[PDB]
Each structure stands twice: as C-alpha cells, then as structure tokens.
Amino acid sequence: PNPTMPVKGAGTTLWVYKGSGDPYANPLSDVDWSRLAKVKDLTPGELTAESYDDSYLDDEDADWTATGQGQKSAGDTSFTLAWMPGEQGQQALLAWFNEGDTRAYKIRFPNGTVDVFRGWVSSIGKAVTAKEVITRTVKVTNVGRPSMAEDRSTVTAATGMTVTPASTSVVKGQSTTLTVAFQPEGVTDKSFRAVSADKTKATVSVSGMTITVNGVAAGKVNIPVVSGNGEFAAVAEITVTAS
Amino acid sequence: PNPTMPVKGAGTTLWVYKGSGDPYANPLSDVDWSRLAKVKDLTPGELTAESYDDSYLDDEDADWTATGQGQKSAGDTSFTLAWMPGEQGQQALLAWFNEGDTRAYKIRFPNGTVDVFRGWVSSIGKAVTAKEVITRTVKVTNVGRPSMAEDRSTVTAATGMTVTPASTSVVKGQSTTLTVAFQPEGVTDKSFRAVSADKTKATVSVSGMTITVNGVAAGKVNIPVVSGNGEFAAVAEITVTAS
Numbered sequence: 001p002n003p004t005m006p007v008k009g010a011g012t013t014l015w016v017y018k019g020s021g022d023p024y025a026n027p028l029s030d031v032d033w034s035r036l037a038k039v040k041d042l043t044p045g046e047l048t049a050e051s052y053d054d055s056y057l058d059d060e061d062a063d064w065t066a067t068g069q070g071q072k073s074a075g076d077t078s079f080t081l082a083w084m085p086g087e088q089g090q091q092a093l094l095a096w097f098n099e100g101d102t103r104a105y106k107i108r109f110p111n112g113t114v115d116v117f118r119g120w121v122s123s124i125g126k127a128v129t130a131k132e133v134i135t136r137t138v139k140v141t142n143v144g145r146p147s148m149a150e151d152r153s154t155v156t157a158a159t160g161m162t163v164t165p166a167s168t169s170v171v172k173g174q175s176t177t178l179t180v181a182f183q184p185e186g187v188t189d190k191s192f193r194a195v196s197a198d199k200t201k202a203t204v205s206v207s208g209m210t211i212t213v214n215g216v217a218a219g220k221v222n223i224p225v226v227s228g229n230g231e232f233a234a235v236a237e238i239t240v241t242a243s
Numbered sequence: 244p245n246p247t248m249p250v251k252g253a254g255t256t257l258w259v260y261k262g263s264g265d266p267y268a269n270p271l272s273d274v275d276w277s278r279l280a281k282v283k284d285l286t287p288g289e290l291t292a293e294s295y296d297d298s299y300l301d302d303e304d305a306d307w308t309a310t311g312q313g314q315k316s317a318g319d320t321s322f323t324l325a326w327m328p329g330e331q332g333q334q335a336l337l338a339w340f341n342e343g344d345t346r347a348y349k350i351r352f353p354n355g356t357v358d359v360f361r362g363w364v365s366s367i368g369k370a371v372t373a374k375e376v377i378t379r380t381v382k383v384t385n386v387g388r389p390s391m392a393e394d395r396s397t398v399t400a401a402t403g404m405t406v407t408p409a410s411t412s413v414v415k416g417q418s419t420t421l422t423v424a425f426q427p428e429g430v431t432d433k434s435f436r437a438v439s440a441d442k443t444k445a446t447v448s449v450s451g452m453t454i455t456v457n458g459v460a461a462g463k464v465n466i467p468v469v470s471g472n473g474e475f476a477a478v479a480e481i482t483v484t485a486s
Contacts, residue, residue: 038249073308085356085392086246088432094393097290100312120312124290128352130253141294143309159442195469197476222478224467226438233438235465235478 001112003153010110014039014079016092017104017116024147027106027114028155029191029228034089038082040135044107045117045142046075074117074142077105083126083136093138097121102143115149117142158184161192161227163234170240174202174215178236180225191228197221201240215240244355246396256351257282257322259336266347267390270359276349277332281325283378287350287358288318288385317360317385320348326369326377336381340364345386356392360385402427404435404475406454406468413445413458413483421454421479423468435475437468444483458483 017023019032051067084090096103106116123139160183167178182188194211196203202215204223213223218240225234260266262275295313327333339346349359362385370378406423413419425431437454439447444462448455456466461483469476 071308072306082249084247084249085354086396087248088398088434091393091396091398094391097292100292102311122292122294122312125318126287126289128252128255128285128287128350130251132252133249134252134352137289141310143297143311145304145307193469193473195474195476197478199474222465224440224469224476224478226467226469230436230438230469232442233440233467235440235467 001110003111003113003155007109007111012039012042012110013108014042014081015106015108016089016096017106018092023104023106023116023118026189026191027116027147027152028189030230031191031193031228033106034092036079036081036089036093037084037087040080040082040133042079042107043077044115045077045119045146047146048073048075074119074144074146076122076139076141077117077119078137078139080127080135080137083134090136093121094124097124105140109149112155113149113152115147117146118144152189156184156188157231158182158188159232161225161232161234163225163236165236167236168239168241170202170213170215170238171243174213174240177210177212180209180211180234192225193228194223194225196223202238213238218242244353246354246356250353252353254353255282255285257285258349258351259332259339260347260349261335266349266359266361270349270357270390270395277335279322279324279332279336280330281327283323283325283376285322285350286320288320288360288362288383288389290389290391291316291318315388317362317387317389319365319382319384320360320362321366321380321382323370323378323380326379333379336364337367340367340381348383352392356395358390358392360389361387398432399427399430400432400472402431404468404470404477406477406479409480411480411482413456413481414486417445417457417483418448419456421456421468423452423454434471435468436471437466439466440464445481456481461485 014036015033018034049072050070052070054068055066102118102120104118106114108114119140119142122141125137127135162181164179194204194206198221201217201219201221202213205212220239222235222237257279258276261277292315293313294310297309297311345363347361349357351357362383365384366382368380404425425433437447437449441464444460445458445464464481465478467478
C-alpha cells in the first residue's frame, strides 16, 4: 500500500455513512459505515467550475479574453452494482432515495486512502437481461464541499493496542473506567469499539478514549476491543465480586 | 430463489392487473393478473428526482454549490414482445392504450420478489422484417409512487450470537474450523468478523461464517468475534502448542 505510486484500481470498495458524528473527521474508520457489495462498476464525481468574465475596458492589450474561476461543483457520481433486494445496504439505499436526506458516502481506493463526498440519490435504475446478472444503477448528486483524498495525505499506523489488564474488583454500581492507548505514542487516525460479551452481568458505555464498565450481576466475563476496521484487538477480564 | 444473492435475470415475467381490488396489497398473488407471454426485451423505467437549488445568499462557504432532492418520477418502462394479436392480453393491452386509463403492471423476477408499477401506455410500435419475427413494442409512462421490491423485505436479527469455546488443541499448522451461529429461529442477517488479538502466536482466516485459525508460536491467545450490529461479541480461547 503505497499512496505515492500508481495503483491498478482493482479492489475499490464503496461505503455509506450511517452514524451521527463528523464523517470528515474520521474517514479511515469503518465503524459507522455500511458497505455496498459487488459493485459492477463505479465512476466518481467530477469537480467542475463555472467561469466569470474578468476583462474590463480600462485594461490595455485587450486582444485576448480573460476569465476567472467562480463557483465550483462536485459533480455526479455513478455506480452500478449487482441487484440484491434482500441484502442490507440496498434497502438502506432505497430508504435514502425515498426520504431524500443528504448523506455521506465514501470510496476506499486500493491505496490506503479514502475519498468521501456528501450528496443525495438523483437517479435509480435497473438493467434486467438474460445471460447476464441483473444490475441496479445508482446516480448521486453531490452537495457542499468534498473531502479530497489529497487533503489528509499523512496517515500513520503501527502495531498494537495497549490496555491495562486485570481490573478485578468491581463495586459501587461498578462504573469504573479502564485506560486504553495506542502503540505509536498515540499519534494516529484512531478508531475502536467495545461491548460486553454477555450483557447480563455487565455493560459498557464507551465514550471518548475511555472505556467505562457498569455491572448488574456477578460472574466472570471478558470484554473485547476492536480497532475500527479491526486490524487489532484486545481482551480484558471482569470478575464481578459479590460485595 | 435467494434475494440476498445476485441472479441471472433469465425467466423474468410480466403481468398486467385486471381485477378491481388494490394491486399494492398482495402483489405475490397471480389471481387477477394477465400474463404478457413471449417477451423479447424488457427495460424497466428508472426512478429519478429533479434537483432544487438550496443556495442561500447569507451562508458561509460559498466556494461550492449545493442542491437538494425535489420531486421524484417513476420513469417510462419499455418492453418488446412477439406480435400475436389473436392472443388475449395483447387485445387487452391495445384496449388499455385506446381508453388510456391508468393501470397497474407487475414484473416477476427470479428471486421471489416483484416490481409493481402504475402507469399508462404512451407508445405502441411494430418492427416487420423478413427472416425475423414480427415484434410489438410497448412503452408505459408511470405515475404516482411505484411499489419497489425493497418494500417487501423484512429483517430478522438480534438475540445475540454464539461460537464454540476453548478447543485448545492447537498444533502443526492447525487451520482449525470455528463455527459461529446465530440463535434466533435460524433466519437472521449474519454479518460478523473475528480478529486475532496477538497476530504472532496465532492468526485467523475469516471466511464465510467459518473461522480458520492457525498457530505459529506457542502461547495463549484469546481471539474475539464481533458482529456488525455492534452489540454481539464473544471470545474464544486458544493455546498454541510448540509440539
């Protein structure tokens, strides 16, 4: 994965945001994104710009006409994918079209870089033919300003999730926080999620780099932590004391 | 007939509603529907929406243009069949064109799902050529809200997730299979992924509801399996033996 060398282009993936946070803040994260599977083909949006005349009479040597860049447009993105009405992601796509709210969608190139736009579905189609797979074709009109893949350009990642083990004694409505950290001294594009393995003895309220546990019942259970896309994981045990 | 997998599109049929009840209620029944047999080519109408400008003079970030989804349209659906005027149903189609009253027509795909639209015939053509069959081409302009296939999809999920624990026999390359199954009445959307917490003593090879786990160096690794729902997870314990 070298973002400084030409890439063949195969393996490009497409995801749609469904969370509530800032899509532009953590685009490399894949936590609140649903993948659209089996994209037959994809053509991304085009960044256009309407020109404005910038030539007045007072200017000398008026033989040549001059223009300047005005308002920029993000263009329309098209993609056709295999038609599976019963697969999660297509149902969300038609719900998005029927509602019409502006949502964020990103494309993960086979380069270690992502490209996320915001837009709404402007066209929905279908191509049913024998001797060939049925393909659903979607067109999306982008709004606002996109987050180009050339903006961040400074991704960092190393090996490991440090997390303090044990944490046995758990009392007072439990509700204790346990410290988590990354290996590259902390400086990365972070992403992670955790949840109790049983949910009958304890539950978690992960919010902002701190994992807080509150328990309901006694027993031994281990909570997992998964690094967003999941390139690393960790496990920490909890033993709910009677008193 | 699995709606969660792509289909070859061969065998798609077309029906026109003839009864008096509501077609939108039960479009899976072929009671009051007339079949238009011998379909040569078919192309369903595309769903489209007109864009309405959403740019205000007093807002910031004027370097880019923004718009929004406006009014949807159901497009024009075309299909060419063989010319058999004596066959009932073609006469009904011609009478529908002559009277010009809006009616419902459904398409049966080889998935068990249907596509029922409402519209009026706006074009009737013919192509007479030697060494070829005489074809009748029909085009229907659709009105109102079409009943898409994805509106007939129901979701079954939750109730947790299960995986067989321990199985400490880890020796000589392993590639041991780990089975992850969902409890609720069989039917569910089984989206999941599992991750190795060490990546050195042992590794996982997630592949379609079966986890392939191999060992490299002796030690104790607990590997977590989580789900895309964001609530369900479990941890399986592995002891990679040197010999």
